[PDB]
Design a binder for this molecule. Structure first.
Ligand code: 84O
Ligand code: 84O
Ligand code: ZN
Ligand code: ZN
Lengths: 261, 261
């Protein structure tokens, strides 16, 4: 039901989803006053990200984003439990304003944002169970700027016309998900926060990479014009655009950085 | 009951104040891509701003800001209707993150923000009646940054000691409120928006001056540290900090400017 625009938009989410008005909300603006270097933030290792090109993975329009299902053998090594992948998805703006990242850096939006959602598979048997438990989820966020054409992101974007409407599903051949990450993944921001969508559970360990990746203007325009929040037969179609939450107050949180300067 | 933090903070305002989740919400980021010069935007005239030094004006801590009551002979000339003053108040951050303006410019907060609230006295008998009506309110916003000591702002800040707690009141002798305005008041941003606090009625014509004023490090710290949201005999005192709303989405809309250069 919830949306990003109009009466069911973000200032109203808390009416139906109490955690959206709770503590530890994401996303946030990353700026100097709230950053602090933490030398304990060692490099993550990305295991099983190189999905077999002979296997296929389900892409689905869920009414709010486009998501790709990921296999539980794919995981992050380096956190205090193993976190296994469950899905990736994006957030973006619109053709006339391609500035739809969720996190901002010193007050500025990037064009888009990729989230790769993982869950604590050591403790929980699936991501839904994990999603309402403390530090049950770990999301990796990649900031996306308008730049060069990106063939790795196009392995997703080339299938958008086959998931235009809510409920639609398509198969994507496997590819190396690490190709979606930026340079120098050892440099990141780390903070305790929440799902950026209803039900906004405050159960996410966030890692936002310091460096953005680039996709082209034409890739952003495809992403911003391919998809609808509504079903194929809905008489009141709604374009899937501007699907990012505004930044949240940082109720006395610090953001820890793995880089000093 | 509403606050800027915890369960009753800004994401939950729309439960009891539905307009907080409606159209035309303020504040917004004033950024270059949405600015448009409008030659119709002529200089306002500030009439009756030189308050009789022989009258006294009520300063209150209302639990959300510090407000000074203003007299209805003080008014703006230059708009469609006369808008008569009713009150002024401020918004600020906190000493660890001293960047608590409501409006932002190109994504950047200023240290604080002063609002001089006026109502349409040609159409309505008083500010309360005007506040939920068409063309009801006009607010002048001054952005504040740290710099040199500002004697005129000290005409308010010297009384903060006396209104530390919710409910408390002091009297301030009349002074020239135009002294709180920045240089080159002819230069401003103008847009239709809302109260930035509950009930968030979309009835405000905003005028945000282009140029900030300065107050000293000591004055900004006094403002951030002088006040509490709670009553004097509350066993759980809360400091009055970070009393600004996050910026709202503003799509397919312009902010008009009285300046091009
Ligand atoms: C429309 O987006 C979602 O619904 C969704 C978004 C995020 S985000 N944007 O990365 O904070 C996360 Cl961590 C989980 C979910 S859904 C969650 C996925 C794990 C299983 C439980 C449902
Ligand atoms: C705590 O701040 C307020 O309550 C308040 C704030 C604003 S703002 N921040 O300038 O948008 C305005 Cl326009 C009116 C009011 S109260 C309004 C004053 C006119 C009579 C009705 C009540
Ligand atoms: Zn997301
Ligand atoms: Zn105000």
């Amino acid at each position: 039901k919830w949306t990003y625009f109009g009466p069911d938009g973000e200032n109203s989410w808390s009416k139906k989803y109490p955690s959206c008005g709770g503590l530890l909300q994401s996303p946030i603006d990353l700026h100097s006053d709230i950053l602090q270097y933490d030398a304990s933030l060692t490099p993550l290792e990305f295991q099983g990200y190189n999905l077999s090109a002979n296997k296929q993975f389900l892409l689905t329009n869920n009414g709010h984003s486009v998501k790709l299902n990921l296999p539980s053998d794919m995981h992050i090594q380096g956190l205090q439990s193993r976190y296994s992948a469950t899905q990736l998805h994006l957030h973006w703006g619109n053709p006339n304003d391609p500035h739809g990242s969720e996190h901002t850096v010193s007050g500025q939006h990037f064009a888009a944002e990729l989230h790769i959602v993982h869950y604590n598979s050591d403790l929980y048997p699936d991501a839904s169970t994990a999603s309402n438990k403390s530090e049950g989820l770990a999301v990796l966020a990649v900031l996306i700027e308008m730049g060069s054409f990106n063939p790795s992101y196009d392995k997703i974007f080339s299938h958008l016309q086959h998931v235009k409407y809510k409920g639609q599903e398509a198969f994507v051949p496997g590819f190396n998900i690490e190709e979606l990450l930026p340079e120098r993944t050892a440099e990141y921001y780390r903070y305790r926060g929440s799902l950026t969508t209803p039900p906004c559970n405050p159960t996410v360990l966030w890692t936002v990479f310091r460096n953005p990746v680039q996709i082209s203007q034409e890739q952003l325009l495809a992403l911003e014009t391919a998809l609808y929040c509504t079903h194929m037969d809905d008489p009141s179609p709604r374009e899937m655009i501007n699907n990012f939450r505004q930044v949240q107050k940082f109720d006395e949180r610090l953001v820890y950085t793995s880089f000093s300067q």
